[PDB]
Amino acid sequence: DLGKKLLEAARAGQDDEVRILMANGADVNAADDVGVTPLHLAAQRGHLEIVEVLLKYGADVNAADLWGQTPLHLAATAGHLEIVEVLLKNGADVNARDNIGHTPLHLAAWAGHLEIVEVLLKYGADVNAQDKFGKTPFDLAIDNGNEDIAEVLQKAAGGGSGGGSGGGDVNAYDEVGWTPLHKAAWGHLEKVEDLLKNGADVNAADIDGYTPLHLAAFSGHLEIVEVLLKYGADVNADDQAGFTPLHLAAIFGHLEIVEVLLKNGADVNAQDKFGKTPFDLAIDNGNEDIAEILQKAA
Amino acid sequence: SKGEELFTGVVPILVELDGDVNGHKFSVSGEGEGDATYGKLTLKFICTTGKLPVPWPTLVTTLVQCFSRYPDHMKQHDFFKSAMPEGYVQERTIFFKDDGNYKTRAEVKFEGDTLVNRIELKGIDFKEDGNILGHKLEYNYNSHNVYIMADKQKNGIKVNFKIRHNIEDGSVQLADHYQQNTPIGDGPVLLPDNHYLSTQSALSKDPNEKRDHMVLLEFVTAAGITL
Ligand code: NA
């Protein structure tokens, strides 16, 4: 009963009530039914006085909830810098792993907390740690658009400046088979050009069978479609994808993309996973001008 | 217009699923928290009726994409939060390769301060010795790309993706997801440009839970639209 009240007082930031409950014998390491302790709640919600008093009274600084999260994970995600520092000074494991294998540095990088990234590095965070999907904190920062953090993390790994714009093995791939060019297909024309100029494989297929040209057609980027084709992209790539770039262009109504695909040999008779041709999809989606062009090319 | 303001902090979650797969009925309840600023879910589910007659991983997608991290430059593309608090209907057909399918209909909405996902699930044509009814799927989960597009009727969104379930013998069972979301309310919603979500999940067990159950940690972010 005292444990529950201490959990609530910690959560609500009632440092006066925390002190009272401790003097009445409350268990500083009380846990709810998902393993969350008073220190977890105070650290997550930014209640520094309460974090300090709990640690003084012997709270387990590395207690893990059901999801593997320690108080440091939660404070690093929530962005509470001084709480991060206090936890580290009281023995928090700087490289503790949540159930996905994230360290606190992964979480701060994911969450966009640059000052916390820097304190975690100072206290021994492993810059090369990988989560269970192979991502480093740098990878998470990049994929989330946290470029300032990515720049810091690449420097801390000895890779020099420039990490903010990507760390450049042009043919790296992650666990879903995305290369830098798959990421650049989403409207980053200058990066697409730079990658191809430095030897990126234009026809790399991801785990679902999608090439960069599929993604550029899905996202509707004409000039990217053009340069992928100029660099030898397979205009009719399908295999595991179950559809071609022309099927995608016919769905989303980009007449100019349909026209360049046809100009480059796209197959008007290719069938998707439901037996539909691009003409069928253009009809189904109300794209009449595209349908007329595809019928002329039948 | 202001649905996103309901997700600035940690939000309690309730999930209720009523399921029937090949006549095997079951109920699943879930609870926990979502922290949409960071695309994070911390949930625990129990099969309240007894043993779950399908593998837990096959229900993950059915069991709240309003908690996806949408970065600041993509705020105008977050359909899911824009439908709140009145919510949206989420419907899927999930085709398991060389096996049966699930069809689901869910309502996702606020009930007070709680975000509630209430689902009905029907499974048909499963093989009693297939990977699903025969429980041959590993208790784990992969990372996926989730593709989002505005629907052609200008009401909601369509969503497509392929889930990969690792099979105990080392092969992979595909579950092909076809999804549609429409607002429950008459208020205006955000119809996005085409983009994707990238997912991470971990499944675990609670040593103090005696019922059939799943602990789930999930991180999801949107991407594909910049500057
Ligand atoms: Na504070």
Author numbering:
A (entry chain A): 13 to 310
B (entry chain B): 2 to 64, 68 to 231
Task: Quote the original article.
DARPins are engineered proteins that consist of 4–5 structurally similar repeats that stack on top of each other, forming a compact protein domain. DARPins combine all potential advantages of single domain binders over antibodies: they are small in size (ca. 18 kDa), possess high biophysical stability, have very high expression yields in E. coli, can easily be genetically encoded for in vivo applications and are devoid of disulphides and hence well suited for applications where they are expressed in the reducing cytoplasm. Structural investigations showed that these DARPins bind to different but slightly overlapping epitopes.
To connect 3G124nc and either YKKD or YRLK we chose flexible GS-linkers. Therefore, two linkers of 7 and 11 aa named GS7 (GGGSGGG) and GS11 (GGGSGGGSGGG) were tested for linking 3G124nc with either YKKD or YRLK. The resulting four constructs were named gc_K7, gc_K11, gc_R7 and gc_R11 according to whether they contained YKKD or YRLK and the linker used was 7 or 11 aa long. All GFP-clamps form 1:1 complexes with eGFP, in which the clamp indeed wraps around approximately half the eGFP molecule and creates a continuous large interaction surface, similar to the superposition of the two parental DARPins on GFP (Fig. 4(a,b and c)). The buried surface area (BSA) of the GFP-clamp complexes is 1625 ± 72 Å2. Between 7 and 11 hydrogen bonds were found in the different structures. Hydrogen bonds of Trp79 from the GFP-clamp to Leu44 of eGFP, Trp79 to Leu220, Gln81 to Lys41, His114 to Gln204, Asp143 to Gln204, Asn156 to Arg73 and Phe226/230 (numbering for constructs with different linker lengths, respectively) to Asn198 seem to be the most crucial ones, since they are found in almost all complex structures. The structures of the GFP-clamps confirm the intended design: both DARPin-derived domains overlay well with the parental DARPins when superimposed on eGFP.
